[PDB]
């Protein structure tokens, strides 16, 4: 159930990104309303800038770890179903690639690290020969329904919010901004 709990955590932080996106949307709508309004006081505009900046940093890091979680839940399922299949019918392709693994098993470490790229090139050429057909394939039935919800590619918002990258000092200062904003909201 490791895949299921990983996907559940992915849904959790995706939904968390969703609610903070709603607080964002509230932030810029009130920004526009107050800027187009009677903005005599400048201090209120100042904290408006502060919260919108810390919120945009928060959604940036939200997109970052959402992409990380999406990649993790992809790879965990990939390796699970892959090793299931490879243990189910491994003998055929083991014999098909027998010389490389035989040289790997009972020779020195240099041959062990030299057989891997030969196997890599063989697999690359096999996959290139197959994929020239271009036929569409579906997900594994054990995980197809879950992966269709998340899709192979993540949200367009998740990827266009990640263009900008901040310095680690900027990350520290914006984390401090998040902490002080949480303290303000507590009061």
């Amino acid at each position: 159930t490791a895949l299921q709990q990983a996907f559940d955590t992915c849904q959790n932080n995706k939904a968390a990104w969703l609610q903070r996106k709603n607080e964002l949307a509230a932030a810029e709508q009130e920004y526009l309303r107050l800027l187009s309004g009677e903005g005599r006081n400048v201090s209120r505009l100042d904290e408006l800038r502060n919260i919108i900046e810390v919120r945009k940093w928060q959604v940036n890091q939200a997109a970052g770890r959402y992409i990380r979680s999406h990649e993790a839940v992809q790879h965990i399922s990939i390796r699970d179903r892959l090793n299931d299949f490879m243990q189910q019918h491994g003998t055929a392709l083991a014999a098909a690639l027998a010389p490389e693994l035989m040289g790997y098993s009972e020779l020195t470490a240099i041959a062990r690290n030299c057989a891997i790229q030969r196997a890599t090139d063989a697999l690359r050429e096999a996959l290139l020969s197959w994929l020239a057909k271009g036929e569409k394939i579906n997900y594994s039935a054990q995980d197809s329904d879950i992966l269709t919800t998340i899709g192979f590619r993540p949200d367009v918002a998740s990827v266009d919010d990640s263009r900008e990258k901040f310095t680690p000092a900027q990350n520290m200062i914006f984390s401090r901004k998040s902490a002080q904003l949480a303290s303000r909201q507590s009061v």
């Binding site: 005599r40 006081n41 400048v42 201090s43 100042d46 904290e47 002080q180």
Partner: protein, 210 residues
């Protein structure tokens, strides 16, 4: 009646009340004495008289009440406050006290205070449950206090220079290295004007020495 408008008003009020109430003279003596005399002759009729100011406690609890208009002179217009009022209302130094004042009988010379209705611009009993300033935990500057007015005046350019020079925040602590003939008067006038204009919510007090 209130002593605030009596202190604010110029000598025109002095001469008008002199020719109205028929005082023997009001010209050649201190303004505080004139205010004392006119308030005495107004209160001798028995009408209720109001008072407002800032309270302070001396070494023996002999409470004084001064006025910000007069820059806190120790004149006769200061209101007496007995230590009983302090011990019954927990009023400390610097508290804004407003209430009915008592005419002085024989034996005392300063006006006393009968009742109180507003302490620190709040209900007097509500001010009893207040947190101490020294007990409050300080913090960094959070709310930016912009110097830019936005009206594009001549000295608004100087205000913009101040903005570009150093940001100002709420609860900050500023020190200015100003040798003489610096024009620092112009800068401080601009600062006061910007504080009054941009942010009327904050209460502004200015202190000048010698």
């Amino acid at each position: 009646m209130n002593l605030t408008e009596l202190k604010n008003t110029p000598v025109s009020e002095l001469i008008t009340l002199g020719e109205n109430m028929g005082l023997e003279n009001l010209a050649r003596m201190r303004k505080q004495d004139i205010i004392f005399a006119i308030l005495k002759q107004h209160a001798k009729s028995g009408e209720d008289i109001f008072g407002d100011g800032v309270l302070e406690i001396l070494q023996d609890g002999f409470g004084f009440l001064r006025s910000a208009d007069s820059s806190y002179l120790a004149g006769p217009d200061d209101i007496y406050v007995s230590p009983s009022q302090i011990r019954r209302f927990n009023l400390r130094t610097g508290d804004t006290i407003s209430g009915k004042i008592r005419p002085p009988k024989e034996g005392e010379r300063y006006f006393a205070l009968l009742k109180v209705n507003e302490v620190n611009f709040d209900k007097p009993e509500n001010a009893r449950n207040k947190i101490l300033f020294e007990n409050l935990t300080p913090l960094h500057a959070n709310s930016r206090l912009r110097m830019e007015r936005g009206n594009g005046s001549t000295e608004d350019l100087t205000a913009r220079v101040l903005d570009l020079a150093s940001p100002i925040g709420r609860g900050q602590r500023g020190l200015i290295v100003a040798p003489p003939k610096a024009g620092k008067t112009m800068l401080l006038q601009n600062i006061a004007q910007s504080i009054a204009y941009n942010h009327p919510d904050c209460v502004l007090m200015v202190l000048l020495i010698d």
